Design a binder for these strands. Structure first.
Ligand code: CA
Length: 615
DNA sequence: TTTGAGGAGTCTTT
DNA sequence: GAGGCGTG
DNA sequence: AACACGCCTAGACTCCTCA
């Protein structure tokens, strides 16, 4: 059915969301109408529309429209879309600000020239503010401007906002089940599909699992609209931060903070609050909380720490939203109090509560403890005996470090140019480990996914699979993912722990063969260079090691997926292996990194920090 | 008025 | 978040 | 030497802007 990828991927999105009664409740007749209208277009019409949907939202010169793969002459196609009410022509081009925007710098010249009142030179931005002030006061001459501006611009089209808004809202619904497609893409700006989805959705093959919904996420179409608002807000803030527009970003955040304070009482929330965590993250309240968290990053960037500390205390005062984020919060609270506000009394309480919170883990739990030792073992603190108070003396077991060198040129070395980690590999190759992978945490991740695939994608857990295109159970990064599969996991873990170096070889082979290619977030099909490499490796690691790593990734992927060693190296014959974090001249171990190395050692694995010093 | 660097916008695959 | 790499 | 920030994140290609 020869459809081009962008259209195929678009169509997968509409289908996947429309086949949900739950989700279709969230659209009015008028809205659904527009969807049908899409389906009523020719393929040519639809191809163009997707293209235009994927461009930036604003007018386009007819000259800057070319898709010979769509049509050698597009006027009919445009006409179609225009009758359909999907696109608008220069004829509806009425705003002036807009017409000027569409005109180039040299075209703003020819208009600043054929209009004596204008100063004929300046930046594109300059001439615009000008042309707008003149049309504002003496209104009649501003119409003659618009006329020639329009004639100068040429024939132009724009996507209609109303139809666009609908597809965007479908996209939003699609992208939730898919984390968010990307943490900015089907968030906003004015939302389209992620590059990865746009290009690949139409070709992707997803794991089989049984859809099974017993729970509404959104009350009504209103509720979704709210959620979509906040989403586009959170996107906007994020875009500011990313460009350096920190002040703008602040206005946005406060604007958002008050918006959220209006909704505080709204009935929809009582229900949201009631949803399981793996679903609650798809509500207004959660998005706003995420905004607030960005707010505190902006407050810190503008060195306004008393205020960051207020927002941080405020977040940490409620357990309904983002409980996983508490680690980051407590940690960040403590760092602000200790290092930016020098208030040590509150810095101690901070830490104390932080460590009592079962929702703080790994990295941020270690960081808080490590600040706690720094304090009660410091001259400028000896005025207290209130951190000698029962500290679970969490002594992360010490690890074998090592130092190699390389000639400096992300850090480039020479040997042909290479990375830091690639230079460490070459060391270990000549240290008798012929085999090695620079895979960081995905090496272990795909192994876990290989060994537990069928339990990952097990049936019998309501709401964790809500539609066709998932690549993980929605509860995957949650405390509950283990809880809800306890008996199966427990048994699978036990079983791997005891499996000889050939049952594992065969388990992996079984999944690889049944699942190869299937999109699943844990697994990277090219992470190993062939099935037999994965086999070679699982053989070296053996049962208890493998079993332990999987145990953590399943108990707490949310807080464990990060910090595994850059490298796994092994001797083909001796079957001996080492887990190696490569640290360049300019870095030391993150907290997560050290917790892991401790943990790997407890499972009886050779672990090693390899430092590189330049020459 | 010429030249050049950096920006913005678009596209990718079945 | 994730994690490296560079400055203060 | 210990601790913090800051910045970034795909890649290629084209046409546009502004100095
Ligand atoms: Ca490293």
């Amino acid at each position: 059915t020869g459809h081009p990828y962008y259209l195929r991927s678009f169509l997968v999105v509409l289908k996947t969301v429309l086949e949900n009664e739950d989700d279709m409740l969230l659209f009015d007749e008028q809205e659904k109408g527009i969807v049908t209208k899409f389906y009523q277009l020719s393929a040519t019409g639809q191809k163009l529309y997707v293209r235009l949907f994927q461009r930036k939202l604003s007018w386009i010169k007819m000259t800057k429209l070319e898709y010979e793969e769509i049509a050698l002459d597009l006027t009919p196609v445009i006409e179609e879309l225009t009758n359909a009410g999907f696109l608008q022509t220069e004829s509806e081009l009425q705003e002036l600000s807009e017409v000027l925007e569409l005109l180039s710098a040299p075209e703003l010249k020819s208009l600043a020239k054929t209009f004596h009142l204008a100063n004929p030179n300046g930046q594109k931005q300059q001439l615009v503010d000008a042309f707008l002030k003149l049309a504002k006061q003496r209104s009649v001459i501003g119409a003659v401007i618009l006329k020639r501006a329009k004639a100068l611009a040429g024939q132009s089209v724009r996507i209609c906002k109303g139809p666009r808004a609908v597809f965007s809202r479908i996209l939003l619904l699609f992208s939730l089940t898919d984390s968010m497609e990307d943490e900015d893409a089907a968030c906003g700006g004015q939302g389209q599909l992620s590059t990865v989805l746009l290009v690949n959705l139409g070709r992707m093959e997803f794991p089989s699992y049984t859809i099974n919904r017993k729970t509404h996420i959104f009350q009504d179409r209103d509720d979704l609209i709210r959620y979509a608002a906040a989403t586009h807000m959170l996107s906007d803030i994020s875009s500011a931060m990313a460009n350096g527009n920190w002040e703008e970003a602040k206005e946005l955040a406060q604007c958002a903070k008050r918006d959220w304070n209006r909704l505080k009482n709204h009935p929809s929330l009582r229900c949201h609050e009631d949803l399981p965590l793996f679903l609650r993250c798809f509500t207004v309240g959660w998005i706003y909380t995420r905004i607030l968290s960005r707010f505190v990053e902006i407050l810190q960037r503008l060195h306004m720490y008393e205020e960051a500390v207020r927002e941080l205390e405020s977040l940490l005062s409620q357990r309904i939203y983002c409980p996983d984020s508490r680690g980051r919060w407590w940690d960040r609270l403590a760092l602000n109090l200790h290092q930016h506000l020098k208030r040590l009394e509150p810095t101690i309480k901070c830490i104390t509560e932080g460590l009592a919170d079962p929702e703080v883990r790994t990295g941020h739990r270690l960081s808080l403890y490590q600040r706690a030792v720094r304090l009660r073992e410091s001259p400028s603190c000896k005025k207290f005996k209130h951190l000698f108070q029962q500290l679970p003396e969490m002594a992360v077991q010490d690890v074998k470090h090592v130092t190699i060198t390389g000639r400096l040129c992300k850090s480039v070395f020479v040997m042909v140019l290479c990375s830091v980690e690639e230079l460490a590999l070459a060391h270990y190759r000549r240290s008798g480990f012929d085999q090695g992978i620079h895979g960081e945490g995905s090496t272990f991740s795909t192994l876990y996914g290989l060994l537990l695939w069928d339990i990952i994608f097990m049936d019998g857990i309501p709401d964790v699979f809500r539609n066709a295109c998932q690549a993980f159970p929605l509860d995957l990064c949650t405390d509950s993912f283990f809880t809800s599969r306890r008996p199966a996991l427990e048994a699978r873990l036990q079983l791997i722990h005891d499996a000889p170096e050939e049952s594992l070889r065969a388990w992996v082979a079984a999944t690889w063969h049944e699942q190869e290619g299937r999109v699943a977030s844990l697994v990277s099909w090219d992470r190993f260079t062939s099935l037999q490499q994965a086999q070679d490796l699982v053989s070296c690691l053996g049962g208890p090691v493998l079993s332990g790593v999987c145990r953590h990734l399943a108990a707490d992927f949310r807080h464990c997926r990060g910090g595994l060693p850059d490298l796994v190296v092994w001797n083909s014959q001796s079957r001996h292996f080492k887990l190696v974090e490569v640290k360049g001249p300019n870095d030391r171990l993150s907290h997560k990194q050290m917790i892991w190395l401790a943990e790997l050692q407890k499972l009886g694995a050779e672990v090693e920090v390899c430092h590189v010093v330049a020459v």
